[PDB]
mmCIF file of all heavy atoms in Angstrom:
data_model
loop_
_atom_site.group_PDB
_atom_site.id
_atom_site.type_symbol
_atom_site.label_atom_id
_atom_site.label_comp_id
_atom_site.label_asym_id
_atom_site.label_seq_id
_atom_site.Cartn_x
_atom_site.Cartn_y
_atom_site.Cartn_z
ATOM 1 N N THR A 1 -11.602 13.959 0.920
ATOM 2 C CA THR A 1 -11.071 12.846 1.697
ATOM 3 C C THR A 1 -9.550 12.924 1.567
ATOM 4 O O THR A 1 -9.050 13.046 0.436
ATOM 5 C CB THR A 1 -11.522 11.502 1.090
ATOM 6 O OG1 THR A 1 -12.919 11.329 1.297
ATOM 7 C CG2 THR A 1 -10.792 10.354 1.700
ATOM 8 N N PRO A 2 -8.804 13.027 2.695
ATOM 9 C CA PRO A 2 -7.344 13.081 2.527
ATOM 10 C C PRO A 2 -6.956 11.695 2.049
ATOM 11 O O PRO A 2 -7.550 10.726 2.523
ATOM 12 C CB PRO A 2 -6.834 13.297 3.963
ATOM 13 C CG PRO A 2 -7.976 13.910 4.668
ATOM 14 C CD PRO A 2 -9.179 13.179 4.114
ATOM 15 N N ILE A 3 -6.033 11.555 1.100
ATOM 16 C CA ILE A 3 -5.615 10.213 0.656
ATOM 17 C C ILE A 3 -4.105 10.092 0.646
ATOM 18 O O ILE A 3 -3.395 11.081 0.818
ATOM 19 C CB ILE A 3 -6.146 9.825 -0.735
ATOM 20 C CG1 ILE A 3 -5.511 10.704 -1.809
ATOM 21 C CG2 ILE A 3 -7.647 9.811 -0.742
ATOM 22 C CD1 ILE A 3 -5.940 10.365 -3.245
ATOM 23 N N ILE A 4 -3.595 8.875 0.556
ATOM 24 C CA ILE A 4 -2.147 8.687 0.507
ATOM 25 C C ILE A 4 -1.749 7.577 -0.439
ATOM 26 O O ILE A 4 -2.474 6.622 -0.584
ATOM 27 C CB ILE A 4 -1.534 8.458 1.925
ATOM 28 C CG1 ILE A 4 -1.141 9.806 2.556
ATOM 29 C CG2 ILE A 4 -0.334 7.570 1.876
ATOM 30 C CD1 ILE A 4 -0.387 9.692 3.886
ATOM 31 N N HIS A 5 -0.646 7.751 -1.152
ATOM 32 C CA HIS A 5 -0.131 6.703 -2.040
ATOM 33 C C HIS A 5 1.179 6.297 -1.487
ATOM 34 O O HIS A 5 1.999 7.159 -1.219
ATOM 35 C CB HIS A 5 0.184 7.174 -3.481
ATOM 36 C CG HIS A 5 -1.017 7.255 -4.366
ATOM 37 N ND1 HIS A 5 -0.965 7.731 -5.651
ATOM 38 C CD2 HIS A 5 -2.317 6.993 -4.105
ATOM 39 C CE1 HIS A 5 -2.186 7.774 -6.148
ATOM 40 N NE2 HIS A 5 -3.025 7.337 -5.228
ATOM 41 N N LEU A 6 1.318 5.012 -1.197
ATOM 42 C CA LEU A 6 2.577 4.433 -0.752
ATOM 43 C C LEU A 6 3.050 3.785 -2.049
ATOM 44 O O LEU A 6 2.302 3.025 -2.678
ATOM 45 C CB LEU A 6 2.340 3.369 0.314
ATOM 46 C CG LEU A 6 1.636 3.947 1.541
ATOM 47 C CD1 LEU A 6 1.410 2.863 2.593
ATOM 48 C CD2 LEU A 6 2.472 5.101 2.093
ATOM 49 N N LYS A 7 4.259 4.111 -2.485
ATOM 50 C CA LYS A 7 4.750 3.556 -3.735
ATOM 51 C C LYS A 7 6.052 2.831 -3.489
ATOM 52 O O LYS A 7 6.845 3.273 -2.671
ATOM 53 C CB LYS A 7 4.932 4.651 -4.783
ATOM 54 C CG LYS A 7 5.271 4.094 -6.163
ATOM 55 C CD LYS A 7 5.484 5.195 -7.204
ATOM 56 C CE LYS A 7 5.811 4.616 -8.572
ATOM 57 N NZ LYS A 7 4.633 4.380 -9.446
ATOM 58 N N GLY A 8 6.231 1.678 -4.142
ATOM 59 C CA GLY A 8 7.456 0.901 -3.974
ATOM 60 C C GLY A 8 7.328 -0.572 -4.350
ATOM 61 O O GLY A 8 6.440 -0.972 -5.114
ATOM 62 N N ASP A 9 8.239 -1.391 -3.833
ATOM 63 C CA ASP A 9 8.216 -2.819 -4.120
ATOM 64 C C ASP A 9 6.914 -3.386 -3.606
ATOM 65 O O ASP A 9 6.485 -3.035 -2.511
ATOM 66 C CB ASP A 9 9.394 -3.499 -3.430
ATOM 67 C CG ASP A 9 9.479 -4.981 -3.735
ATOM 68 O OD1 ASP A 9 10.158 -5.339 -4.705
ATOM 69 O OD2 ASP A 9 8.893 -5.791 -2.995
ATOM 70 N N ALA A 10 6.313 -4.300 -4.357
ATOM 71 C CA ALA A 10 5.056 -4.907 -3.943
ATOM 72 C C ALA A 10 5.069 -5.674 -2.606
ATOM 73 O O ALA A 10 4.114 -5.566 -1.821
ATOM 74 C CB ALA A 10 4.488 -5.749 -5.050
ATOM 75 N N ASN A 11 6.107 -6.476 -2.354
ATOM 76 C CA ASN A 11 6.186 -7.207 -1.087
ATOM 77 C C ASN A 11 6.373 -6.263 0.058
ATOM 78 O O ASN A 11 5.787 -6.466 1.118
ATOM 79 C CB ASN A 11 7.321 -8.210 -1.064
ATOM 80 C CG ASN A 11 7.069 -9.382 -1.959
ATOM 81 O OD1 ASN A 11 6.154 -9.364 -2.778
ATOM 82 N ND2 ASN A 11 7.870 -10.434 -1.793
ATOM 83 N N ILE A 12 7.188 -5.225 -0.134
ATOM 84 C CA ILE A 12 7.384 -4.258 0.945
ATOM 85 C C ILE A 12 6.082 -3.584 1.359
ATOM 86 O O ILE A 12 5.859 -3.351 2.550
ATOM 87 C CB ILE A 12 8.392 -3.181 0.583
ATOM 88 C CG1 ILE A 12 9.769 -3.801 0.408
ATOM 89 C CG2 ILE A 12 8.419 -2.111 1.620
ATOM 90 C CD1 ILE A 12 10.817 -2.784 0.075
ATOM 91 N N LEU A 13 5.249 -3.236 0.385
ATOM 92 C CA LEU A 13 3.956 -2.623 0.667
ATOM 93 C C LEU A 13 3.018 -3.605 1.369
ATOM 94 O O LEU A 13 2.203 -3.221 2.204
ATOM 95 C CB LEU A 13 3.316 -2.096 -0.622
ATOM 96 C CG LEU A 13 4.136 -1.038 -1.369
ATOM 97 C CD1 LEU A 13 3.325 -0.513 -2.522
ATOM 98 C CD2 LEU A 13 4.560 0.088 -0.478
ATOM 99 N N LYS A 14 3.053 -4.853 0.934
ATOM 100 C CA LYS A 14 2.233 -5.896 1.541
ATOM 101 C C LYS A 14 2.572 -6.092 2.985
ATOM 102 O O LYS A 14 1.671 -6.221 3.809
ATOM 103 C CB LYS A 14 2.308 -7.224 0.775
ATOM 104 C CG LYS A 14 1.801 -7.090 -0.652
ATOM 105 C CD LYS A 14 1.821 -8.391 -1.415
ATOM 106 C CE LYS A 14 1.341 -8.181 -2.856
ATOM 107 N NZ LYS A 14 1.041 -9.445 -3.566
ATOM 108 N N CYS A 15 3.862 -6.051 3.308
ATOM 109 C CA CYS A 15 4.286 -6.199 4.695
ATOM 110 C C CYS A 15 3.916 -4.973 5.522
ATOM 111 O O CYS A 15 3.485 -5.089 6.676
ATOM 112 C CB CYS A 15 5.777 -6.535 4.787
ATOM 113 S SG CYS A 15 6.156 -8.245 4.251
ATOM 114 N N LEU A 16 4.079 -3.800 4.922
ATOM 115 C CA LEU A 16 3.735 -2.540 5.577
ATOM 116 C C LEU A 16 2.233 -2.574 5.907
ATOM 117 O O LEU A 16 1.822 -2.256 7.022
ATOM 118 C CB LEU A 16 4.058 -1.370 4.638
ATOM 119 C CG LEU A 16 4.203 0.065 5.169
ATOM 120 C CD1 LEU A 16 4.850 0.918 4.095
ATOM 121 C CD2 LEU A 16 2.892 0.650 5.602
ATOM 122 N N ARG A 17 1.439 -3.052 4.934
ATOM 123 C CA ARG A 17 -0.024 -3.166 5.069
ATOM 124 C C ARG A 17 -0.388 -4.097 6.240
ATOM 125 O O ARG A 17 -1.352 -3.829 6.955
ATOM 126 C CB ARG A 17 -0.656 -3.664 3.763
ATOM 127 C CG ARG A 17 -2.127 -3.307 3.666
ATOM 128 C CD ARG A 17 -2.902 -4.081 2.636
ATOM 129 N NE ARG A 17 -2.225 -4.081 1.352
ATOM 130 C CZ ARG A 17 -2.064 -5.170 0.600
ATOM 131 N NH1 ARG A 17 -2.558 -6.338 0.993
ATOM 132 N NH2 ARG A 17 -1.293 -5.131 -0.481
ATOM 133 N N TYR A 18 0.319 -5.210 6.410
ATOM 134 C CA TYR A 18 0.083 -6.076 7.565
ATOM 135 C C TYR A 18 0.370 -5.316 8.853
ATOM 136 O O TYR A 18 -0.353 -5.465 9.833
ATOM 137 C CB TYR A 18 0.983 -7.309 7.568
ATOM 138 C CG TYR A 18 0.641 -8.368 6.572
ATOM 139 C CD1 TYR A 18 1.608 -8.844 5.675
ATOM 140 C CD2 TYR A 18 -0.621 -8.934 6.549
ATOM 141 C CE1 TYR A 18 1.314 -9.869 4.768
ATOM 142 C CE2 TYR A 18 -0.933 -9.952 5.669
ATOM 143 C CZ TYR A 18 0.037 -10.413 4.789
ATOM 144 O OH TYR A 18 -0.253 -11.485 3.973
ATOM 145 N N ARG A 19 1.446 -4.537 8.867
ATOM 146 C CA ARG A 19 1.816 -3.742 10.048
ATOM 147 C C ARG A 19 0.812 -2.641 10.416
ATOM 148 O O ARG A 19 0.731 -2.216 11.562
ATOM 149 C CB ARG A 19 3.216 -3.169 9.885
ATOM 150 C CG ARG A 19 4.248 -4.238 9.777
ATOM 151 C CD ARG A 19 5.635 -3.663 9.719
ATOM 152 N NE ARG A 19 6.589 -4.680 10.172
ATOM 153 C CZ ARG A 19 7.361 -5.417 9.389
ATOM 154 N NH1 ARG A 19 7.321 -5.261 8.062
ATOM 155 N NH2 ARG A 19 8.151 -6.329 9.948
ATOM 156 N N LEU A 20 0.099 -2.128 9.420
ATOM 157 C CA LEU A 20 -0.905 -1.099 9.655
ATOM 158 C C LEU A 20 -2.000 -1.627 10.566
ATOM 159 O O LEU A 20 -2.754 -0.830 11.113
ATOM 160 C CB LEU A 20 -1.517 -0.635 8.334
ATOM 161 C CG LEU A 20 -0.511 -0.038 7.341
ATOM 162 C CD1 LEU A 20 -1.182 0.394 6.048
ATOM 163 C CD2 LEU A 20 0.227 1.121 7.979
ATOM 164 N N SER A 21 -2.133 -2.956 10.691
ATOM 165 C CA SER A 21 -3.193 -3.568 11.531
ATOM 166 C C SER A 21 -3.108 -3.106 12.968
ATOM 167 O O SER A 21 -4.060 -3.236 13.729
ATOM 168 C CB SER A 21 -3.164 -5.097 11.498
ATOM 169 O OG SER A 21 -2.171 -5.620 12.358
ATOM 170 N N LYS A 22 -1.912 -2.680 13.352
ATOM 171 C CA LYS A 22 -1.650 -2.153 14.683
ATOM 172 C C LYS A 22 -2.118 -0.699 14.776
ATOM 173 O O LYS A 22 -2.288 -0.153 15.865
ATOM 174 C CB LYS A 22 -0.148 -2.232 14.988
ATOM 175 C CG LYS A 22 0.222 -1.485 16.246
ATOM 176 C CD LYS A 22 1.701 -1.451 16.568
ATOM 177 C CE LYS A 22 1.908 -0.478 17.733
ATOM 178 N NZ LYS A 22 0.949 -0.731 18.853
ATOM 179 N N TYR A 23 -2.354 -0.091 13.621
ATOM 180 C CA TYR A 23 -2.731 1.315 13.552
ATOM 181 C C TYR A 23 -4.038 1.698 12.848
ATOM 182 O O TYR A 23 -4.181 2.843 12.393
ATOM 183 C CB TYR A 23 -1.590 2.033 12.878
ATOM 184 C CG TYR A 23 -0.292 1.878 13.623
ATOM 185 C CD1 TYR A 23 0.632 0.901 13.267
ATOM 186 C CD2 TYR A 23 0.042 2.749 14.655
ATOM 187 C CE1 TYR A 23 1.853 0.807 13.911
ATOM 188 C CE2 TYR A 23 1.269 2.660 15.299
ATOM 189 C CZ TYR A 23 2.163 1.697 14.910
ATOM 190 O OH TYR A 23 3.408 1.717 15.474
ATOM 191 N N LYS A 24 -5.010 0.787 12.868
ATOM 192 C CA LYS A 24 -6.315 0.931 12.220
ATOM 193 C C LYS A 24 -7.024 2.205 12.576
ATOM 194 O O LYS A 24 -7.871 2.667 11.821
ATOM 195 C CB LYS A 24 -7.208 -0.221 12.633
ATOM 196 C CG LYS A 24 -6.638 -1.535 12.266
ATOM 197 C CD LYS A 24 -7.302 -2.606 13.057
ATOM 198 C CE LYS A 24 -7.259 -2.297 14.579
ATOM 199 N NZ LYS A 24 -5.893 -2.025 15.164
ATOM 200 N N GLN A 25 -6.787 2.704 13.782
ATOM 201 C CA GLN A 25 -7.424 3.963 14.187
ATOM 202 C C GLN A 25 -6.806 5.132 13.445
ATOM 203 O O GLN A 25 -7.389 6.200 13.383
ATOM 204 C CB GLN A 25 -7.366 4.218 15.723
ATOM 205 C CG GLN A 25 -6.039 4.703 16.307
ATOM 206 C CD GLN A 25 -5.054 3.587 16.513
ATOM 207 O OE1 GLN A 25 -3.996 3.777 17.097
ATOM 208 N NE2 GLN A 25 -5.419 2.406 16.096
ATOM 209 N N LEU A 26 -5.607 4.927 12.919
ATOM 210 C CA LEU A 26 -4.875 5.962 12.204
ATOM 211 C C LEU A 26 -5.151 6.129 10.706
ATOM 212 O O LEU A 26 -4.489 6.927 10.029
ATOM 213 C CB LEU A 26 -3.378 5.798 12.465
ATOM 214 C CG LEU A 26 -2.921 5.901 13.920
ATOM 215 C CD1 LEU A 26 -1.418 5.854 13.929
ATOM 216 C CD2 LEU A 26 -3.417 7.185 14.563
ATOM 217 N N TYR A 27 -6.037 5.304 10.164
ATOM 218 C CA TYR A 27 -6.438 5.419 8.757
ATOM 219 C C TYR A 27 -7.774 4.689 8.629
ATOM 220 O O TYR A 27 -8.188 3.941 9.534
ATOM 221 C CB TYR A 27 -5.412 4.803 7.804
ATOM 222 C CG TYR A 27 -5.369 3.306 7.886
ATOM 223 C CD1 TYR A 27 -6.177 2.534 7.053
ATOM 224 C CD2 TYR A 27 -4.616 2.663 8.866
ATOM 225 C CE1 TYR A 27 -6.256 1.181 7.205
ATOM 226 C CE2 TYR A 27 -4.684 1.297 9.022
ATOM 227 C CZ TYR A 27 -5.510 0.569 8.191
ATOM 228 O OH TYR A 27 -5.597 -0.780 8.360
ATOM 229 N N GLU A 28 -8.447 4.887 7.506
ATOM 230 C CA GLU A 28 -9.730 4.233 7.273
ATOM 231 C C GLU A 28 -9.625 3.007 6.393
ATOM 232 O O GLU A 28 -9.914 1.901 6.835
ATOM 233 C CB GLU A 28 -10.731 5.238 6.718
ATOM 234 C CG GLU A 28 -11.072 6.247 7.758
ATOM 235 C CD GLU A 28 -11.652 5.576 8.999
ATOM 236 O OE1 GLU A 28 -12.810 5.113 8.922
ATOM 237 O OE2 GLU A 28 -10.946 5.462 10.033
ATOM 238 N N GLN A 29 -9.199 3.209 5.145
ATOM 239 C CA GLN A 29 -9.068 2.124 4.194
ATOM 240 C C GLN A 29 -7.719 2.070 3.500
ATOM 241 O O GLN A 29 -7.093 3.108 3.298
ATOM 242 C CB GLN A 29 -10.182 2.234 3.188
ATOM 243 C CG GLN A 29 -11.492 2.300 3.878
ATOM 244 C CD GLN A 29 -12.609 2.183 2.957
ATOM 245 O OE1 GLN A 29 -13.335 1.199 2.997
ATOM 246 N NE2 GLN A 29 -12.782 3.184 2.094
ATOM 247 N N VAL A 30 -7.256 0.840 3.226
ATOM 248 C CA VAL A 30 -5.983 0.596 2.548
ATOM 249 C C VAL A 30 -6.422 -0.202 1.332
ATOM 250 O O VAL A 30 -7.240 -1.102 1.450
ATOM 251 C CB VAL A 30 -4.972 -0.299 3.326
ATOM 252 C CG1 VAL A 30 -3.553 0.146 3.062
ATOM 253 C CG2 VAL A 30 -5.241 -0.325 4.739
ATOM 254 N N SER A 31 -5.938 0.163 0.163
ATOM 255 C CA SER A 31 -6.318 -0.566 -1.017
ATOM 256 C C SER A 31 -5.408 -1.757 -1.124
ATOM 257 O O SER A 31 -4.511 -1.923 -0.322
ATOM 258 C CB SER A 31 -6.102 0.291 -2.258
ATOM 259 O OG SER A 31 -4.726 0.420 -2.526
ATOM 260 N N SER A 32 -5.735 -2.656 -2.037
ATOM 261 C CA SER A 32 -4.860 -3.764 -2.339
ATOM 262 C C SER A 32 -3.784 -3.108 -3.264
ATOM 263 O O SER A 32 -3.837 -1.910 -3.562
ATOM 264 C CB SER A 32 -5.653 -4.847 -3.067
ATOM 265 O OG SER A 32 -6.430 -4.274 -4.123
ATOM 266 N N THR A 33 -2.736 -3.847 -3.570
ATOM 267 C CA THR A 33 -1.678 -3.343 -4.429
ATOM 268 C C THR A 33 -2.124 -3.199 -5.888
ATOM 269 O O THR A 33 -2.861 -4.027 -6.448
ATOM 270 C CB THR A 33 -0.382 -4.182 -4.321
ATOM 271 O OG1 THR A 33 0.009 -4.297 -2.944
ATOM 272 C CG2 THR A 33 0.722 -3.474 -5.018
ATOM 273 N N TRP A 34 -1.719 -2.089 -6.477
ATOM 274 C CA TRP A 34 -2.055 -1.771 -7.841
ATOM 275 C C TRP A 34 -0.857 -1.137 -8.503
ATOM 276 O O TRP A 34 0.122 -0.780 -7.838
ATOM 277 C CB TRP A 34 -3.329 -0.896 -7.915
ATOM 278 C CG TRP A 34 -3.332 0.448 -7.187
ATOM 279 C CD1 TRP A 34 -3.760 0.697 -5.919
ATOM 280 C CD2 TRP A 34 -2.955 1.714 -7.734
ATOM 281 N NE1 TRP A 34 -3.678 2.045 -5.641
ATOM 282 C CE2 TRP A 34 -3.205 2.688 -6.745
ATOM 283 C CE3 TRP A 34 -2.443 2.113 -8.957
ATOM 284 C CZ2 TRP A 34 -2.962 4.035 -6.948
ATOM 285 C CZ3 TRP A 34 -2.201 3.434 -9.163
ATOM 286 C CH2 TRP A 34 -2.462 4.399 -8.161
ATOM 287 N N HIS A 35 -0.887 -1.046 -9.813
ATOM 288 C CA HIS A 35 0.241 -0.469 -10.499
ATOM 289 C C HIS A 35 -0.318 0.227 -11.735
ATOM 290 O O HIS A 35 -1.471 0.004 -12.093
ATOM 291 C CB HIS A 35 1.204 -1.600 -10.888
ATOM 292 C CG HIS A 35 0.662 -2.514 -11.942
ATOM 293 N ND1 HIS A 35 0.042 -3.710 -11.647
ATOM 294 C CD2 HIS A 35 0.586 -2.376 -13.291
ATOM 295 C CE1 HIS A 35 -0.402 -4.264 -12.766
ATOM 296 N NE2 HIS A 35 -0.086 -3.473 -13.777
ATOM 297 N N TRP A 36 0.495 1.055 -12.382
ATOM 298 C CA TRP A 36 0.060 1.722 -13.589
ATOM 299 C C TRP A 36 0.186 0.730 -14.711
ATOM 300 O O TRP A 36 1.213 0.073 -14.866
ATOM 301 C CB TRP A 36 0.943 2.919 -13.930
ATOM 302 C CG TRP A 36 0.823 4.041 -12.928
ATOM 303 C CD1 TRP A 36 1.828 4.533 -12.170
ATOM 304 C CD2 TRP A 36 -0.388 4.724 -12.496
ATOM 305 N NE1 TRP A 36 1.341 5.468 -11.283
ATOM 306 C CE2 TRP A 36 -0.010 5.615 -11.460
ATOM 307 C CE3 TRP A 36 -1.745 4.661 -12.877
ATOM 308 C CZ2 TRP A 36 -0.939 6.458 -10.784
ATOM 309 C CZ3 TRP A 36 -2.681 5.500 -12.198
ATOM 310 C CH2 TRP A 36 -2.256 6.389 -11.159
ATOM 311 N N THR A 37 -0.828 0.687 -15.546
ATOM 312 C CA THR A 37 -0.878 -0.181 -16.698
ATOM 313 C C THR A 37 0.310 0.067 -17.650
ATOM 314 O O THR A 37 0.815 -0.858 -18.289
ATOM 315 C CB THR A 37 -2.237 0.029 -17.356
ATOM 316 O OG1 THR A 37 -3.201 -0.794 -16.693
ATOM 317 C CG2 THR A 37 -2.224 -0.244 -18.781
ATOM 318 N N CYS A 38 0.796 1.289 -17.747
ATOM 319 C CA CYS A 38 1.934 1.495 -18.629
ATOM 320 C C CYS A 38 3.207 0.784 -18.128
ATOM 321 O O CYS A 38 4.102 0.444 -18.905
ATOM 322 C CB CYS A 38 2.203 2.983 -18.804
ATOM 323 S SG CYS A 38 2.859 3.775 -17.354
ATOM 324 N N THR A 39 3.255 0.522 -16.828
ATOM 325 C CA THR A 39 4.427 -0.071 -16.205
ATOM 326 C C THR A 39 4.536 -1.588 -16.114
ATOM 327 O O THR A 39 3.675 -2.282 -15.548
ATOM 328 C CB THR A 39 4.638 0.494 -14.781
ATOM 329 O OG1 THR A 39 3.510 0.161 -13.964
ATOM 330 C CG2 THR A 39 4.797 2.021 -14.816
ATOM 331 N N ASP A 40 5.655 -2.073 -16.647
ATOM 332 C CA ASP A 40 6.009 -3.487 -16.634
ATOM 333 C C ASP A 40 6.905 -3.651 -15.412
ATOM 334 O O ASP A 40 7.122 -4.769 -14.936
ATOM 335 C CB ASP A 40 6.786 -3.852 -17.916
ATOM 336 C CG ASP A 40 6.866 -5.361 -18.162
ATOM 337 O OD1 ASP A 40 6.340 -6.143 -17.336
ATOM 338 O OD2 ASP A 40 7.446 -5.765 -19.195
ATOM 339 N N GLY A 41 7.423 -2.519 -14.927
ATOM 340 C CA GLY A 41 8.297 -2.493 -13.768
ATOM 341 C C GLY A 41 7.703 -3.293 -12.629
ATOM 342 O O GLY A 41 6.942 -2.777 -11.799
ATOM 343 N N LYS A 42 8.035 -4.579 -12.620
ATOM 344 C CA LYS A 42 7.544 -5.501 -11.618
ATOM 345 C C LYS A 42 7.967 -5.077 -10.220
ATOM 346 O O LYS A 42 9.065 -4.551 -10.003
ATOM 347 C CB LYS A 42 8.039 -6.924 -11.918
ATOM 348 C CG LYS A 42 6.974 -8.007 -11.778
ATOM 349 C CD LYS A 42 6.430 -8.078 -10.358
ATOM 350 C CE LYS A 42 5.214 -8.991 -10.262
ATOM 351 N NZ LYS A 42 4.488 -8.830 -8.965
ATOM 352 N N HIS A 43 7.023 -5.215 -9.301
ATOM 353 C CA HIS A 43 7.224 -4.917 -7.893
ATOM 354 C C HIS A 43 7.484 -3.504 -7.396
ATOM 355 O O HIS A 43 6.727 -3.052 -6.542
ATOM 356 C CB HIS A 43 8.257 -5.864 -7.305
ATOM 357 C CG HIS A 43 7.658 -7.075 -6.676
ATOM 358 N ND1 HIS A 43 8.101 -7.589 -5.477
ATOM 359 C CD2 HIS A 43 6.612 -7.845 -7.054
ATOM 360 C CE1 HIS A 43 7.348 -8.618 -5.139
ATOM 361 N NE2 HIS A 43 6.437 -8.795 -6.078
ATOM 362 N N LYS A 44 8.510 -2.795 -7.885
ATOM 363 C CA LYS A 44 8.764 -1.445 -7.345
ATOM 364 C C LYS A 44 7.856 -0.321 -7.884
ATOM 365 O O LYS A 44 7.956 0.850 -7.493
ATOM 366 C CB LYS A 44 10.259 -1.087 -7.342
ATOM 367 C CG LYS A 44 10.577 0.052 -6.364
ATOM 368 C CD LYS A 44 12.073 0.321 -6.147
ATOM 369 C CE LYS A 44 12.273 1.305 -4.971
ATOM 370 N NZ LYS A 44 13.678 1.424 -4.448
#
């Protein structure tokens, strides 16, 4: 399965995710936002 990781600020990804609604035919599934447990780095 080809996959993609969009990495960055949490709000920016959330907004990008809303915009993907215009392009549903262009991808199958978008996950909710997640982060690495080692990282305290809030948002980005």
Side-chain angles (χ1 to χ4, degrees):
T1 290
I3 67 178
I4 270 186
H5 279 176
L6 300 180
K7 187 181 180 91
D9 183 91
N11 289 12
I12 295 181
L13 300 186
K14 299 182 182 193
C15 288
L16 198 166
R17 202 197 311 134
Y18 287 126
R19 298 184 157 102
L20 300 180
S21 80
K22 170 183 171 48
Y23 301 96
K24 301 162 307 306
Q25 77 280 188
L26 300 186
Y27 70 91
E28 292 302 287
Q29 306 190 113
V30 214
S31 72
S32 47
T33 307
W34 58 268
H35 68 264
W36 293 119
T37 276
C38 71
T39 62
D40 195 359
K42 224 299 171 193
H43 267 222
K44 200 171 190 167

